[PDB]
Design an enzyme around this catalytic site. Sequence first.
Site, mmCIF file in Angstrom:
data_model
loop_
_atom_site.group_PDB
_atom_site.id
_atom_site.type_symbol
_atom_site.label_atom_id
_atom_site.label_comp_id
_atom_site.label_asym_id
_atom_site.label_seq_id
_atom_site.Cartn_x
_atom_site.Cartn_y
_atom_site.Cartn_z
ATOM 1 N N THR B 1 53.498 19.896 38.015
ATOM 2 C CA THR B 1 53.865 19.669 36.862
ATOM 3 C C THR B 1 53.756 18.009 35.936
ATOM 4 O O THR B 1 54.696 17.298 36.257
ATOM 5 C CB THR B 1 55.636 20.011 36.758
ATOM 6 N N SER B 2 53.113 18.111 35.251
ATOM 7 C CA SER B 2 52.347 16.733 34.525
ATOM 8 C C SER B 2 51.946 16.912 33.396
ATOM 9 O O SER B 2 51.174 17.891 33.131
ATOM 10 C CB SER B 2 51.317 15.921 35.580
#
EC number: 3.4.25.1
Lengths: 250, 196, 139, 233, 85, 262, 243, 241
Positions: B1-2
């Site tokens: 999750t970036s």
Amino acid sequence: MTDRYSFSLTTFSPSGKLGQIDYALTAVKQGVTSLGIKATNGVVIATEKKSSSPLAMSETLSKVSLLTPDIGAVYSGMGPDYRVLVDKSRKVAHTSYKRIYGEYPPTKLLVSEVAKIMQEATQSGGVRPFGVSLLIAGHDEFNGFSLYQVDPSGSYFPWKATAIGKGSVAAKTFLEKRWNDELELEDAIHIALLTLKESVEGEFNGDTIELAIIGDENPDLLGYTGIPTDKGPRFRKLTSQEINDRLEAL
Amino acid sequence: TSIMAVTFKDGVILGADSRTTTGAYIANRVTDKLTRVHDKIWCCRSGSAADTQAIADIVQYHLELYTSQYGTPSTETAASVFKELCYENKDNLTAGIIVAGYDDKNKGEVYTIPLGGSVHKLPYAIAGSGSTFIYGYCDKNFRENMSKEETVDFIKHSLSQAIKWDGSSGGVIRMVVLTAAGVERLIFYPDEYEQL
Amino acid sequence: KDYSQILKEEFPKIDSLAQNDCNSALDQLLVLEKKTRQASDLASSKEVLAKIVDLLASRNKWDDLNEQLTLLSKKHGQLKLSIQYMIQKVMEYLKSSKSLDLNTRISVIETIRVVTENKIFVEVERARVTKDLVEIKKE
Amino acid sequence: FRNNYDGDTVTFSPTGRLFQVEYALEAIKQGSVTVGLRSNTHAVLVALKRNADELSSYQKKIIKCDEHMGLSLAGLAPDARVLSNYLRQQCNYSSLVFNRKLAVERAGHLLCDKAQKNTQSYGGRPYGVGLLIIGYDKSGAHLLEFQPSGNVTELYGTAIGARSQGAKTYLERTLDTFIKIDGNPDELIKAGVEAISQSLRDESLTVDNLSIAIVGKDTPFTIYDGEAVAKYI
Amino acid sequence: RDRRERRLIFGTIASKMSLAPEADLDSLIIRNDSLSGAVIAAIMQEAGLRAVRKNRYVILQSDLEEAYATQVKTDNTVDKFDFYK
Amino acid sequence: GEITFDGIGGLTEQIRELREVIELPLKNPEIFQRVGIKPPKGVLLYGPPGTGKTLLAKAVAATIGANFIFSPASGIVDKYIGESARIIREMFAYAKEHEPCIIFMDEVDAIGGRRFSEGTSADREIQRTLMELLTQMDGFDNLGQTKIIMATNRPDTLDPALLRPGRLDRKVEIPLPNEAGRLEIFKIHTAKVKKTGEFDFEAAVKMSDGFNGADIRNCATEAGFFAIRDDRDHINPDDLMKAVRKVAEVKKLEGTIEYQKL
Amino acid sequence: TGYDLSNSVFSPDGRNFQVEYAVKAVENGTTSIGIKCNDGVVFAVEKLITSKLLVPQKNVKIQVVDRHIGCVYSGLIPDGRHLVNRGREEAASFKKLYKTPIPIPAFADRLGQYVQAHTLYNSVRPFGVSTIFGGVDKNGAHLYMLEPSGSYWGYKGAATGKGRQSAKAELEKLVDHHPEGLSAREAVKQAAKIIYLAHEDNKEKDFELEISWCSLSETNGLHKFVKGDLLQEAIDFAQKEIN
Amino acid sequence: GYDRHITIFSPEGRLYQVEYAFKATNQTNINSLAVRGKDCTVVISQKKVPDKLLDPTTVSYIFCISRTIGMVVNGPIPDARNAALRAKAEAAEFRYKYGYDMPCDVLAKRMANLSQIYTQRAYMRPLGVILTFVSVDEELGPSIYKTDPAGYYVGYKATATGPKQQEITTNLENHFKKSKIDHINEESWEKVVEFAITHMIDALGTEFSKNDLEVGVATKDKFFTLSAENIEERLVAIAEQ
């Protein structure tokens, strides 16, 4: 917010009957002539479409809708009130039945709920009664073939053959003499085309005539067969091109 | 999750990955976290997917009512709508969504909304689990009003380290180019940025 | 703006700048006339536009002017009476010339849509040039 | 025009001006007369107190909304009690939230909206009560007259009641008097006594009728009665 | 009056009126509803009155529908209102 | 002769409408005979008051120059036995010997009523007057050459039997003129009146909008009083605009007509 | 007829009498005007003097929506004040949710549905006043007048009340004065002269002048009431023209 | 009498108030012309020209409800904006519950029922406007649905309103009989807009300038309105023929 007597449902006729019922039957009496016939092996309903502007498309206005395809419907009454009634009839049929039994609603229970919708307009003050005259034609496994007539007064009665519209008085005699209980679905379709034609003879083609029948279950109309036990849709709407095929042979 | 967004001279590009991890298992590798609430307004979703997908759908029709009634929305107008839903729901919703739109006069604008539900202006922004690892790498190599090629390389090199250090971030690198030309979709395979 | 328009129209007039006068006329009508052409506001038609026909008369071939006079009434215009006023001017030079212009008088009737088709409520100009066509058929 | 058009507050006139607005003014003329004025220091309200007979207690027309404010009722009794209790909560609501006392200019704006709610909707009785609101704030003394239509207009002084034209005319002679008088409440009280006497037919001049209440930078709003008002009378 | 009984009026009056066979009267016969012998007579008379200002002798298609909208005015709809049958 | 077609100007939209059904059939009747249409008999002139409907009778009469019969409504209602219905029979009887010409009716609000019976107060003699007017149009005598000009304040008071086709075939409305129609009228009233060369053109229309928009002649009378106070024979162009503004508060008679279209 | 006895009834003309009589009620009130400039708008109203007891320049019929929009009306004062307070909560609610000032063309959209709903319900009385508003939004100068029927359009100039058409003669002159339009400060002196011209028939009573305007080139989009030397300069200019 | 003011049925069994809803439709006297082409939909409405104190750009009878969706209203303008906000609200809420572009046939059903609820209520009055919805459907292509103020809706080849609608309907009726098709040739939407202007001028008998009309355009995945320069450009190519 309530303003004085605005719920007043006082209007009454000197004869004792509701004045809103007589004015509703009067408007339907002048309207377009519909009809329906319940035969031995099938049920046929037919009506004439609306011309109005010559540039109007007949595919937009549909005088025969679909609730669940065990039952057909046709109306000679209010055009706009039919769309509102069907929207409410489905929500009542889905909540009181499909959200419980999760199946196709039976004919006897569905007609009783439609009669309540016309009553709630008469029971609740300030709202005018529905001026629609509905012919509910369906086939179940208990009562078999059933043809019901729901009057705008809020009551329903079964009929072997009936007609509503301008020629409803003349067509009532035509259905007695021409049609008999021994006649089957194929015999009733030809009578439905002749009786409806005698109303307005201007255009007898299939463009202004909407014909629909409830026959045996068709597996192609359901779109999927994974289960041989599940029955297909009993209601099948006939194409206007197919209507002209029976007119040439009539 | 970036997720990350970096403005430049001709516009802003919002980077995101394709990986969404639930626990120790990766449910789907092609999942896209980008949601379009407006043609010129984009948002990068991060954190809990159910909280972000619900807010993104509720705001989606708010700007439609704002466009057909009031007028064309800006970056600040859209970013405030995500804020009001996260203010009362901050306990029931976790949203790390960054709201970055596009403007003709103001060029690009990036607004970061943390779990607290606050809106502030930054030229560059990052969020998610993989952002804290590259958190020090982005501030050093950041430039003011860079070119389009330098913007792609800055986002590519940043997200490349976020995938190596953080296991919850990975997959293909999808970019959205916002400029006077229009919206351009880009994608990068692991056989390219991992070798750079 | 009236007296200021007639000064700008007469600047590319003397010497006509070879045949470029056509580019200094229609182009000025497009830049101008966004205000005028209401009722009395015409600074060109019936006044300056009538002098354009006399400038091209007895100079070049009449096949080019017949195409120019057609486009004047083809697009917008205001009142064909000023255009029909110029038709009498065209018939004036063709009558005093004749020779190779005998067939030109017939071509103007067919080329110009004002004489052939209907434009305004006054068709009288169509019948005036019709008698001239009958006199040609008699010869 | 009984019933037909204008019989209801919603129905308008063929001219466009609702007659119920003009009929509400007649209720003020039926009530008691109230004369009031102000200055750059204090403000004086002179209200007439009538009764039925000698045994009937004179009804006090002055109702105290706030410590620094005051009003008077020349209109119907029940319509004022709803407004007096509404304005009473506004003084405490402004002190609870904004901590500032209710402004006289801000009180007339909120009171203007209360009168329309009966005319805007159906039913109920519209507010035709005459109200003279005074007060003292950091902006000085202010007197805002409340019309039965809901409009509020600030004046140096005015009068509401039966034959109010007589008291308004005396204020024209004294227009240059009470304004220039500062720090002298004695001359401001004497101006209100002679103002109401012009409109009255001289029924009873005793001290049980005229009710004088004054508010200013030093002495707050105080209702004087009995021997208190017997000095000037 | 119904639709069929009118053509014996319009068709008979057209014998004394000058009109082209291209006329659109085969259409308006459906539009005609709730008329009488005196109202129809003024319809054909109006067709010639508008032809004078238009500098027309033989009645054209433009002199029919335009002249029909004059004498036909009684109520806004006059044809089955708008639905609610 | 006083007012001509140039004095009624601004109505030209409705002026060219009258001359086709009046001047043309009385001049070249073969135009209507070639097409086959019958010449129109009656013509209805209505509209708001103050638009010059009374001047329409003198304007048409100043051109044709034929005979004209003025028959007021309340002048022929004089109570006698059989005389009320005989007066109408007269005008159509004299039309043959005196030539068809034009017959004029002036402001008839009476005979066109249904007249429910309260006792009618001797007005039954008016009922046979309406019966004579209706039977005359449907009579077997030769008609269509004589023109019947009937003017009234509002059409609805007329007999709906007359308004229907077969008797009155022509309904000509005279509504409020447009912005360009009023402009021609100001020059008419200011023509014979001594003015100054600065007299206003298009601003007088913009001064009065919706207050009157019909009768301009009121403005010409009010403008004379402003010049007397300033001791001037000529009218001040600014005082002319002040006279137009004064008319806004002069009427206050309401009388807005949206209902007389039909 | 009987269509005016009940509220919200369709007349054979197409509009209710009470809606038609609501327009005539505006002429019974004071005359308010307005001028739309390039960078802003100018508002000029009129307050009647009842008697010599009126305190000069205190009660101001000019209302200011937030800081960026002025609001003025005519006709019934209380009926127009409630419409202003309704727009106050709407301009604040829009600023809370979208974090931005409300635009002028959409400012009438919230009040348009509000006023329209009053002409529908039977128990609810329609509005009989006209409202003029304007200011400087992100889209520049805009001027709109809200009719009592609930309709509005873009107006290069605003006029309402008894002297509305007497003002239209002067407002249409500004088009012929300059093709681009008068400036913000130049329109202040012209709006004051119109008040004295529309009062020629109103001379039975006195009046006081109140002018307000908002421009980007002076207050940077901030509504400000005219006071100080700017007010005395506009009055002296209009005093010499009426001579 | 009282039978005209009551919401319930009349002695003739026919509501007079429904008929009175069409009385206000002729107040503006606007003649709208909208035809269904092949890939596009052309909508042209008359724009009334007020005095110089009003902005003709702000005056429009056509509003944008949603993407590719547009509506022209002939009737009371103040009653139109109240109905325009109702269609815009149902357009955005439809996508939140489904997520696909809202078709025109369904949008004509929602606004018809909501306008019909006003007919049943004794307080809320029916909308006295005319709702004409135009868009380009994915499956059905160009479609025009004219919703009556009482809740009736049906499709038309070429819609017409105003008192002159008889001139527009008849002139466009014979044009469709010769080609025997409801669509229009020249698939390019540029010339299709110009084809409707010529048929409108010949039917009305008066040529209108760019300021006397407004032209809506409905294309695939786009909706816009031609400006003053685009409308003027259309009259240039029409003038040359």
